[PDB]
């Protein structure tokens, strides 16, 4: 029989835990891993968004690497419209967050000359001249290649390698002429317009926060986005610049630093301290450093974020092949599962959702794999190691959290209900990775939206006004969670859930926990 | 500084181990994970095979789902030709195994318009008719489809699902008429000729070993293949049938059962006992059972095989996208890494090698990821577990093996040298997963070839005749290993390696171990 | 069924390990814990010594706190006579070590006055005056008590507590007059002659090595003792002074620092570095510092010594009550068991052997408890933890040790045979605590005698001359071990043992191990 890999949960070793994984051990209804969907022409329509939400989407990511403000404003407007089309039912309403992915220090090449083939082919052992002559800005070809990085020449050297499109195409500088570069094509073949360019071994002096960026972040504040995915941040200083720009009015916007180059990996510790969360941007990371090493950086990053208690996102190409096909490849399914097992708080879709033919099938697939992997976690082991690395604490919530999660493990609670406004308490509970869903009730619409960044936290926005008597106000928000839970099939009348509340309205966190029957 | 994730090797927890993975901790030269390549039109040429070998190929897999005997006979002949082109040098000669992959109980739709390239769409609602009438055999079109499985009507029901062409296409039986099925198209769109068919929730009664299979196995014995990849085996009886056909003359051919359907996963334990090894055929497995659960089956299978000490292979779509591209996707790189970390003895390529545009790049990539992940393993923990999970033990080689690997850990030996003929002693040493390469010297050309099925065993065929004095014959095979090692850059004069030999010529295994300087 | 707590050895937790200890799981014949017997009037007779040996004695301790040199010389002569009375049989001969226990900076009282033997009573709340006037030297009573510590007035002050006769009697300095001390009796009652005195809260300026000491050590060198138990050593410097006096001629005499005061416990680390071994002298230690804290110091000491690989002895009052009774108390039995379980290499008897009515019964009891507790160890857990404290940093012989011990666990070897002259190789094997007996064959009579200091090493002196051929000389010393083992009931023809030898005569340690049948 058994359910949600409970037999394997009892194992005393990882080897036995693995040997006990059962494909016939049904996972639970609730899904703990937040799904982040990148919105594009394939999913901008309010009607598709509505389905995006029912299928699982928690975070709508706007990639400011392309598109104008009015563009992104309309799409932001549509996700909100689709979201609120549900607001009518307080029990079935699923909050949805809006994220903003910075363009950052990108290098991009121009448009191929119209006058000639659709795409130019850089054949191995062929010459190619890279120029900055704005004249060739839209007249690229097998001979001339224009880039949008002016100082490029001062940071590269003879012998330096240049990667272009998703470092599918490789170039080697042979002559470093003043204001231009004569190179030789090593790899790749076909080149299109506006393609990504990477200088792995160089020190790109572009700004962390460029003019263009400053305006986009400002725009986010204006548009009231919940988070910011800062691209190519390579040190604490960068995070701080982004923090400063968001300034006072955007103080509450959570900054998620994207790690996508050797520098950022090397200075990860100081970056994590300055950020609210981290994103393993495997795409550029896999170009900036050898592809075979990404898995190392991913696990290291997810590991340290877990230990720190800050959200971490795994992104890029997870279900890549589903851009053109309805079902994922065996490796891609594996990729998602291992990301969840590695400890990732959220998994992302960018392309499979932005411009793919199967956006809805893709999020549904991550949703399926998520629940399955989440159950295959070795909680007993993870908890212990995670509490070990928990320094001596003068913060009582950490204790409440560990006690509660432990309590949830013992009575196989159906869920952990947490009343919070800043979201802190719930964040703490999620940190110690309980198996059961963390139903966080709050009146702060934003902390609800931001809650998705945390593994296990199921945000529930309470719209009822604050009751006179604190006890009644509590039983109110608690019953709301109870109902949402019954509605979502997380638990029925008679199951056990642990409830974390504040003893008195003035309590600075959840200092009260109870084991309670759902009825 | 550090090398081969040794700093992270010292951690006491998995969380710390992960937090310590360093992308600047260079792996070692030696690669322990065997690479199995599926040979096809893109890699049959002797010249390509030569490069296949230099790039890392250890096992050539002939997929008998297609091709005639003379076809596979020539390709087998070519891999041997390319292999022997190296025989001349005893030190740099890498033996290559030949593997035969069985067709088994497959279900294939017939031809379309009696033509190779096929058309016809389908998509939702579109009713489709599945006839068994061998008349319209080679006349499949948009409305009537023919299957090569005759009893298909007795094993399926109304409402049953039928997957066509790698589960991309989905049908649902609406009317189960006698000798034909009227179905409705759920998923899928375009169907070609002779495409695979799967009946997920049905009990297919086809024969474990068919008439077609019997001749192919017989042929394998004739061609002297080292192993058989028994497709779709679902129980011990199945393995035994294959064992019987190979019979006495093929007694030494190792049988690798392929697990690719619910039944096989369910009866896995008895199948493992009857087999010499196991292959996680995620392809059909991901169709036969929900895709999201494959990762569960994989980890469970790899785990149990490790515990049992029999070789286990992970296969299908690992570097899939590389069939059309020079670099893999981030998910695919991750998939290989986790396969090695899960503990798979060999990883496979089938298509990326058989008919892709980048066969060489693909094996080279697995080779790269393999070494990287092999170092990222948590040996201390693994060993302890493999040990604390090795019930009983009277096979002294177990003792010798565990003590030697433990000794190799302590003095960070560069390699373990094992003299063996049946290969048993080396198998035992690999079982306990040393970090260093296992250089197994043997005069039994076949055990050398078969050795690749084991993680870490680097086979070396000794051609020198047996010396008069046992001591000299030993020091001879040992120096050959010493030389092979120095040549392959596994170690230089002065490094330490542990040597496992037999005290006297009559010893039944490796009962003598030594810590020795390589010089 | 089961034997030697092997069922409990399979447990994965200490709690389970304990819950599985079975009083019906017969321990093995061999005893790994060395037994150190203090020789006195109750056991100086050669005839008693002979029985002391057959009963289990490994080390004869001569306590130079009393007796003249001619006295100790005769007793040393008798143990040697009793020991050699067995030398005739090379197989049944058990070497015995002679240990010299230093007097050190002791503080003794004088002889009660001549009254009718009537010992003196010190009722609570009485005065009593301690003088130094060498006139009361043999005339102590209720009013005056002489001390042999001349500078006692300069180290104590008013309020200072003074303990007499094994801390049984308590006195508090009320008036610190010049050259005397007026005190008040807190505890204690009856005072005899020449009793022990402790100033726990003072800084005794007596010489670590006194005039009396230097001569005694010199004598030890002359008498060729195997080890020295240096009393009250409180710092590295102390150990060095002793090392220096033993000088060049006594360079091979192992120095065992005795930890018996707060200072020694506080500076333990530097003392252990300088010593060859350590003795937890609970006697004075339990006076110098609170009684309830000794168990902490013992475990800590035994712990760090284990971690360092140096012999550690537990001593004093273990079977105390047996001085007058044939059977030990329940606490004493427990005390011996827990000492073996703590990890003590040797357990001592001093009094129960020196002047008790049941010297033989006492050593026999320690012998019985030892084997019983040695089986009740949690080897799996202990080993894993020792290996951790021994990083991957290598000397090389410890690789062999760890590998060998691991191998002995796996095939449940009957014993580990080690050929060594300096004894080093065996010491290393013992360090990693195997379950089976370590039969160490040597031609160095002394290293054999000293070997007893190490848990599990069963010394065997080889008298045969060195064979021409290194191979024959090895099989010779191995067969001797094989024979000794069969004789002692350690193992019969057909059992498995691991043999650690040197490949070539020049090897600097045991670099060759083998799993071999005993026959
Ligand atoms: K971007
Ligand atoms: K096949
Ligand atoms: K003494
Ligand atoms: Mn990027
Ligand atoms: Mn298949
Ligand atoms: Mn003492």
Please list, residue by residue across C27-66, b when 16 or more beta carbons sit within 10 angstroms of its beta carbon and e when fewer do.
bbebbbbbbbbbbbebbbeeebbbbbbebbbbbbbbbbee
3-state secondary structure of B67: coil
* Contact assessment for residue C40 and residue C354, using Cβ atoms and an 8 Å cutoff: yes
Q: How far is the CA of A147 from the centre of ligand 1 (A)?
A: 18
* Contact assessment for residue C466 and residue C441, using Cβ atoms and an 8 Å cutoff: no
Residue A115 DSSP one-character state:
S
Please report residues of A whose CB lies closer than 8 A to that of B357: none
Residue C444 DSSP one-character state:
-
* Contact assessment for residue A70 and residue A384, using Cβ atoms and an 8 Å cutoff: no
Read off the tokens for A459.
């945000």
Distances from the Cα of A328 to the Cα of B191, B258, C326, angstroms: 18, 21, 80
Residue A132 DSSP one-character state:
-
Strands C169-175 and B254-259: unpaired
Which of C358, C318, C362 lies closest to C340, judged by CA?
A: C318
* Contact assessment for residue B399 and residue B387, using Cβ atoms and an 8 Å cutoff: no
How far is the C-alpha of B431 from the C-alpha of B383, rounded, in Å?
A: 10
* Contact assessment for residue C473 and residue C466, using Cβ atoms and an 8 Å cutoff: yes
Measured between CA atoms, the residue of chain C closest to residue A13 is: C12
Half-sphere exposure at residue C141, Cβ-oriented, CA atoms within 13 angstroms: 10
In a 10 Å sphere around its CB, with 0-12 CB exposed, 13-18 middle and 19+ buried, how is residue A391 labelled?
A: exposed
Domains of chain B with CATH codes = 1-30+374-519 (3.40.1380.20), 31-104+208-373 (3.20.20.60), 105-207 (2.40.33.10)
Read off the tokens for A397.
């919530």
CA triple C341-C344-C347, angle to 5 deg:
105
How far is the C-alpha of C64 from the C-alpha of C135, rounded, in Å?
A: 26
Measured between CA atoms, the residue of chain B closest to residue C9 is: B388
Contact A331 B318 (CB under 8 A): yes
CA triple C439-C444-C447, angle to 5 deg:
65
How far is the C-alpha of B317 from the C-alpha of C402, rounded, in Å?
A: 42
C292: which residues sit within 8 A by CB, 6+ positions away?
A: none
The H or E element spanning position A129 is strand A127-131
* Contact assessment for residue B329 and residue B365, using Cβ atoms and an 8 Å cutoff: no
Q: Minimal Cα–Cα distance from C282 to chain A, Å? A: 35
Report the Cα–Cα distance between both ends of chain C, in Å, rounded. Answer: 26
How far is the C-alpha of B361 from the C-alpha of C105, rounded, in Å?
A: 78
Instruction: Tell me if A142 is assigned to a ligand binding site.
Output: no
A285: which residues sit within 8 A by CB, 6+ positions away?
A: A259, A260, A261, A265, A294, A297
Instruction: Tell me if B435 is assigned to a ligand binding site.
Output: no
Measured between CA atoms, the residue of chain A closest to residue C13 is: A12
How far is the C-alpha of B49 from the C-alpha of B214, rounded, in Å?
A: 28
How far is the C-alpha of B512 from the C-alpha of C513, rounded, in Å?
A: 6
Resolution of this structure in Å = 2.8
Read off the tokens for C109.
């009282």
How far is the C-alpha of B315 from the C-alpha of B284, rounded, in Å?
A: 11
Read off the tokens for A390.
């928990």
CA triple C55-C61-C62, angle to 5 deg:
135
Instruction: Tell me if C303 is assigned to a ligand binding site.
Output: no
Read off the tokens for B495.
């490094």
Neighbours of chain B (3+ CB pairs under 8 A): A, C
CB neighbours (10 Å) of residue A252? 15
Question: Which of A33, A183, A316, A442 does the annotation list as catalytic?
Answer: A316
Q: For tokens 């690789």, what's the residue?
A: C399
Instruction: Tell me if B101 is assigned to a ligand binding site.
Output: yes
C203: which residues sit within 8 A by CB, 6+ positions away?
A: C155
A163: which residues sit within 8 A by CB, 6+ positions away?
A: A169, A170, A171, A197, A198, A199, A200, A287
Read off the tokens for C268.
């333990």
Contact B393 C384 (CB under 8 A): no
Q: Is B447 a catalytic residue?
A: no
3-state secondary structure of B111: coil
How far is the C-alpha of B436 from the C-alpha of C233, rounded, in Å?
A: 47
Residue A490 DSSP one-character state:
S
* Contact assessment for residue B449 and residue B459, using Cβ atoms and an 8 Å cutoff: yes
Candidate from A167, A294, A339 with C-beta closest to B333? A294
How far is the C-alpha of A519 from the C-alpha of A517, rounded, in Å?
A: 6
Q: For tokens 């033996």, what's the residue?
A: B95
The H or E element spanning position C180 is strand C180-185
How far is the C-alpha of A369 from the C-alpha of A333, rounded, in Å?
A: 7
Question: Which of A31, A33, A61, A447 does the annotation list as catalytic?
Answer: A61
CA triple B404-B405-B411, angle to 5 deg:
85
Query: Could you give the residue ranges of the DSSP H alpha helices within C444-503?
Result: 445-451, 470-488
How far is the C-alpha of C368 from the C-alpha of C444, rounded, in Å?
A: 30
Contacts 24+ apart (CB under 8 A), A215-221: A216/A64, A216/A69, A216/A100, A216/A102, A216/A103, A217/A100, A217/A102, A217/A242, A217/A245, A217/A246, A217/A250, A218/A245, A219/A69, A219/A72, A220/A100, A220/A246, A220/A250, A220/A253, A221/A246, A221/A247, A221/A249, A221/A250, A221/A253
CA triple A154-A157-A162, angle to 5 deg:
100
Read off the tokens for C394.
């290598």
Read off the tokens for A393.
């604490």
The H or E element spanning position B336 is helix B330-342
Residue A494 backbone dihedrals phi, psi, to 5 degrees = 120, -20
- DSSP letters, B305-324, are HHHHT--EEEESSTTGGGGT
* Contact assessment for residue A217 and residue A255, using Cβ atoms and an 8 Å cutoff: no
**Cα Rg for chain A, rounded, in angstroms?**
24
How far is the C-alpha of C397 from the C-alpha of C505, rounded, in Å?
A: 16
Contact C407 B399 (CB under 8 A): yes
Residue B2 DSSP one-character state:
-
Q: Is B176 a catalytic residue?
A: no
CB neighbours (10 Å) of residue A410? 11
Which of B183, B128, B130, B192 lies closest to B161, judged by CA?
A: B183
How far is the C-alpha of A301 from the C-alpha of A267, rounded, in Å?
A: 11
Smallest-distance ligand from the CA of B260: 5
Please report residues of B whose CB lies closer than 8 A to that of A336: 331
Which of A406, A400, A407 lies closest to A427, judged by CA?
A: A400
Measured between CA atoms, the residue of chain C closest to residue A12 is: C12
Give the total residue count for chain A.
519
How far is the C-alpha of A459 from the C-alpha of A30, rounded, in Å?
A: 12
Q: Is B31 a catalytic residue?
A: no
Q: For A414-477, what is the HEC assignment? A: CCEEEECCCCHHHHHHHHCCCCCCEEEEECCHHHHHHHCCCCCEEEEECCCCCCCCHHHHHHHH
Please report residues of C whose CB lies closer than 8 A to that of B409: 392
Instruction: Tell me if A114 is assigned to a ligand binding site.
Output: no
Q: How far is the CA of C367 from the centre of ligand 6 (A)?
A: 24
Report the Cα–Cα distance between both ends of chain A, in Å, rounded. Answer: 26
* Contact assessment for residue B448 and residue B484, using Cβ atoms and an 8 Å cutoff: no
3-state secondary structure of B500: strand
CA triple B400-B402-B404, angle to 5 deg:
65
Residue A222 backbone dihedrals phi, psi, to 5 degrees = -55, -50
Smallest-distance ligand from the CA of A212: 1
Distances from the Cα of B378 to the Cα of A420, B16, B22, B409, angstroms: 39, 11, 14, 12
Strands C144-146 and A180-185: unpaired
Q: Minimal Cα–Cα distance from A87 to chain B, Å? A: 31
Residue C327 backbone dihedrals phi, psi, to 5 degrees = -125, 140
* Contact assessment for residue A301 and residue A266, using Cβ atoms and an 8 Å cutoff: no
- DSSP letters, B150-198, are TTHHHH--TT-EEEETTTTEEEEEEE--TTEEEEEE-S-----SS-BEE
How many angstroms separate the most distant Cα atoms in chain B? 79
Distances from the Cα of A118 to the Cα of A126, A130, A431, B326, angstroms: 19, 20, 51, 21
How far is the C-alpha of A180 from the C-alpha of A459, rounded, in Å?
A: 54
Give the total residue count for chain C.
519
Contact A307 B19 (CB under 8 A): yes
Neighbours of chain C (3+ CB pairs under 8 A): A, B
Dihedral of alpha carbons B106, B111, B117, B122, sign = negative
Distances from the Cα of C353 to the Cα of B156, B266, B361, C42, C328, angstroms: 87, 67, 79, 7, 13
Q: Minimal Cα–Cα distance from B390 to chain C, Å? A: 9
Dihedral of alpha carbons A106, A109, A114, A120, sign = negative
C153: which residues sit within 8 A by CB, 6+ positions away?
A: C132, C176, C178, C179, C180, C181
How far is the C-alpha of B454 from the C-alpha of B309, rounded, in Å?
A: 9
Q: Minimal Cα–Cα distance from B89 to chain A, Å? A: 31
How far is the C-alpha of C211 from the C-alpha of C104, rounded, in Å?
A: 10
Read off the tokens for B270.
């008895």
- The residue ranges of DSSP E strands in A252-398, in sequence order, are 254-259, 277-281, 312-315, 346-349
Give the total residue count for chain B.
519
The H or E element spanning position C162 is strand C161-164
Q: Which residues surround ligand 2, an ion (CB under 5 A)?
A: B 63, 65, 101, 231
Residue B175 backbone dihedrals phi, psi, to 5 degrees = -130, 120
* Helix pair angle (C359-375, C330-342), 10° resolution: 50
A216: which residues sit within 8 A by CB, 6+ positions away?
A: A64, A69, A100, A102, A103
Read off the tokens for C104.
């050190």
CB neighbours (10 Å) of residue A411? 12
3-state secondary structure of A84: helix
Please list, residue by residue across A98-114, b when 16 or more beta carbons sit within 10 angstroms of its beta carbon and e when fewer do.
bbbbbbbbbbbbbebbe
**Cα Rg for chain B, rounded, in angstroms?**
24
* Contact assessment for residue B168 and residue A326, using Cβ atoms and an 8 Å cutoff: yes
């Amino acid at each position: 029989i058994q359910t949600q890999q409970l037999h394997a949960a009892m194992a005393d070793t990882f080897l036995e835990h693995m040997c006990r994984l059962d494909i016939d051990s049904a996972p639970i209804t609730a899904r703990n891993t937040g799904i982040i969907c990148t919105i594009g022409p394939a999913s901008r329509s309010v009607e598709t968004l509505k389905e995006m939400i029912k299928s699982g989407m928690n975070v709508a990511r706007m990639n400011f690497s392309h598109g104008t403000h009015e563009y992104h404003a309309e799409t932001i407007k549509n996700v909100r419209t689709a979201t609120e089309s549900f607001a009518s039912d307080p029990i079935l309403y699923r909050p949805v967050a809006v994220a903003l992915d910075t363009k950052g220090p990108e290098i991009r090449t121009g448009l191929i000359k119209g006058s000639g083939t659709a795409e130019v082919e850089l054949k191995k052992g062929a010459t190619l001249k890279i120029t900055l002559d704005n004249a060739y800005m839209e007249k690229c070809d097998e001979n001339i290649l224009w880039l949008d990085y002016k100082n490029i020449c001062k940071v590269v050297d003879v012998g330096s390698k240049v990667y272009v499109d998703d470092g599918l195409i490789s170039l080697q500088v042979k002559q470093k002429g003043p204001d231009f570069l004569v190179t030789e094509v090593e790899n790749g073949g076909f080149l299109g317009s506006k393609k990504g360019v990477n200088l792995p071994g160089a020190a790109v002096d572009l700004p962390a926060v460029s003019e263009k960026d400053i305006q986009d972040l400002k725009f986010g504040v204006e548009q009231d986005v919940d988070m910011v995915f800062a691209s190519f941040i390579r040190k604490a200083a960068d995070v701080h610049e982004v923090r400063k720009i968001l300034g006072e009015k955007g103080k509450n916007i959570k900054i998620i630093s994207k790690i996508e180059n050797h520098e950022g990996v090397r200075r990860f510790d100081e970056i994590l301290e300055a950020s609210d969360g981290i994103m393993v941007a495997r795409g550029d990371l896999g170009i900036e450093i050898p592809a075979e090493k990404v898995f190392l950086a991913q696990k290291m990053i997810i590991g340290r974020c877990n230990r720190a208690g800050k959200p971490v996102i795994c992104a890029t190409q997870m279900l890549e092949s589903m851009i053109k096909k309805p079902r994922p490849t065996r490796a891609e399914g594996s990729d998602v599962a291992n990301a969840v097992l590695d400890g990732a708080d959220c998994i992302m879709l960018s392309g499979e959702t932005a411009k793919g033919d199967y956006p809805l099938e893709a999020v549904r697939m991550q949703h399926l794999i998520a629940r399955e992997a989440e159950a295959a976690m070795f909680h007993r082991k993870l908890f212990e190691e995670l509490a070990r690395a928990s320094p001596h604490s003068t913060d009582l919530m950490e204790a409440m959290a560990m006690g509660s999660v432990e309590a949830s493990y013992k009575c196989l609670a159906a869920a952990l209900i947490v009343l919070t406004e800043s979201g802190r308490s719930a964040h703490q509970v999620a940190r110690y990775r309980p198996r059961a869903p963390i139903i966080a009730v709050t009146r702060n619409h934003q902390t609800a939206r931001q809650a998705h960044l945390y593994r296990g936290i199921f945000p529930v926005v309470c719209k009822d006004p604050v009751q006179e008597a604190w006890a009644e106000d509590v039983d109110l928000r608690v019953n709301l969670a109870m109902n949402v839970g019954k509605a979502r099939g997380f638990f029925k009348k008679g199951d056990v859930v642990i409830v974390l509340t504040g003893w008195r309205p003035g309590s600075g966190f959840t200092n009260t926990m109870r084991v309670v029957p759902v009825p």
